[PDB]
Design a protein around this ligand. Structure first.
Ligand SMILES: N[C@@H](Cc1c[nH]c2ccccc12)C(=O)O
Ligand SMILES: N[C@@H](Cc1c[nH]c2ccccc12)C(=O)O
Lengths: 288, 288
């Protein structure tokens, strides 16, 4: 692996909160970011920029697989787009992120080396984004801003104790389905969508660059739909109710019909976790 | 002009709030984004994603000036990075933004045409970011998250009624100085920094891709220092007190020493505007 220390940090942070996330959410970042004795605004920037930085990194990873763009042009693109993000994040509570971002932009021997760096770095920043999303106070605007070929797998949420059986559609997005199946089993933090609607997503431990030709409109997905979003952090997404987002999502599978009614209880508890209580909910996906 | 309607919107939004920002900050976006009867989370996503999208667009504009990357590769880079940002923004309150993002990605007959599209589109998104930053509720975490040659110009703030004299350093970053000087006079909204400390910035009506070799550490800048950040929105930055951001910022000029004592009351009043009251403070920059 190109960045072996990040690999150790990736394996560690699947179950442990990164120390930089804890410092940001408690206002203990050195040099004290934030204007006039508060740390919410810096917290707001830390959470959003690391998320959008991860989106940039994944698209740069995709570009590294595009053979029409030379390695020299790839590095030029990275060296232009990266610094404004990574230098701010290093000052705003992510020194190790900034350290490795500038390491990714070092001269590269080949396309494979650069793709290796970008794939590992993206998964690392994806995990920091995963924890930042879980702890960000999404309820802070509450009250004040209110409206008026079928591979069987098992999904378990703890400490809820809810289990559902599901099927991975291995013949729709075959490369994507194989990428998810090879990561099994894994246990990651389960969090709720904060804009979309009644859906949950969990940052899975992989970076898939597979094509996603088979998609469906998010606001048209059935209850129990398993979809996968590479662009927003390589997340396993479980739809449990009506949604709103109009973008289409790659189809991964579906919870079995005899277990789809079990998802309402999970979505409610996971919503309370992400929105208010921050009590962790752990999703385990395993091969049947 | 490649995108003449954006030029008209750019001219209008210098003094008028874009309807997109008005609907986002009042929870009147037609798609009703946000989970469980609130629109703060969608508001939080709208403000930050449009800001970081603008940062991406500027670095893509700079990439359009790099003739080591072919026009074909530039479009490939744009078509890879852009959709995940623009399609979400089109659903989360910026339909016209997503529309012209697809315009920019269309086949281009020349580098000059594509650079024209990116320069115009970047300024348009920069102004959306400007108004979004002004109206975002930065004080929401206020109580719950707290710690424990020389070209003479005049800067006027209204309706505060305070004027200062300054000098633009035309020999340090020369092309940057001419870019700003060619945009004078302009009157734009004056807002406060929300992370770095006691400085204020205003989105100026230009997109400069000039080199900025002469820089100064932000946390080391003097009182009255005029800085210019191309990468964070082509903003004229007035430092009136201590700061904490460790990055280096391009040096544009400085307020005259005899008028530097007036900046303290402007900064405090601009802080109240950005952080709490949202009463507009208008900055006018003109040559002497
Ligand atoms: N809908 C997701 C966020 C999201 C989906 N697609 C995106 C694309 C870009 C940025 C954010 C998103 C949520 O509610 O959390
Ligand atoms: N200092 C700015 C924020 C900022 C500075 N540099 C940046 C780079 C990227 C993103 C944000 C920033 C503020 O407090 O408002």
């Amino acid at each position: 692996s190109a960045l072996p220390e990040l690999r150790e940090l990736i394996a560690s942070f699947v179950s442990e909160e990164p120390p930089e996330i804890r410092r940001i959410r408690t206002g203990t970042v050195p040099d004290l970011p934030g204007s006039y004795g508060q740390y919410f605004t810096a917290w707001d920037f830390s959470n959003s920029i690391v998320r959008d930085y991860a989106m940039n990194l994944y698209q740069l990873t995709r570009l590294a697989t595009d053979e029409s763009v030379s390695v020299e042009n790839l590095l030029t693109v990275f060296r232009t787009l990266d610094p404004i993000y990574s230098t701010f994040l290093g000052y705003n509570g992510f020194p190790v992120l900034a350290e490795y971002a500038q390491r990714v932009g070092q001269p590269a021997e080949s396309r494979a080396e650069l793709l290796d760096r970008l794939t590992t770095f993206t998964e690392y920043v994806n995990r920091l984004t995963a924890w930042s999303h879980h702890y960000f106070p999404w309820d802070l605007g509450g009250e004040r801003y209110r409206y008026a070929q079928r591979i069987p797998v098992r999904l378990t949420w703890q400490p809820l104790g809810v289990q559902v059986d599901a099927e991975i559609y291995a013949d729709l997005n075959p490369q994507l389905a194989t990428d998810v199946l090879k990561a099994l089993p894994f246990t990651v933090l389960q969090d709720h969508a904060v804009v979309s609607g009644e859906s949950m997503y969990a940052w899975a431990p992989l970076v898939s660059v597979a094509p996603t030709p088979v998609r469906e409109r998010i606001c048209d997905a059935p209850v129990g739909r398993l979809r996968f979003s590479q662009a927003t952090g390589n997340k396993v997404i479980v739809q449990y109710g009506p949604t709103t987002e109009t973008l289409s999502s790659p189809v991964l599978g579906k919870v079995v019909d005899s277990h789809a009614d079990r998802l309402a209880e999970v979505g409610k508890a996971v919503w309370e976790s992400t929105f208010s209580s921050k009590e962790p909910v752990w999703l385990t996906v395993e091969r049947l």
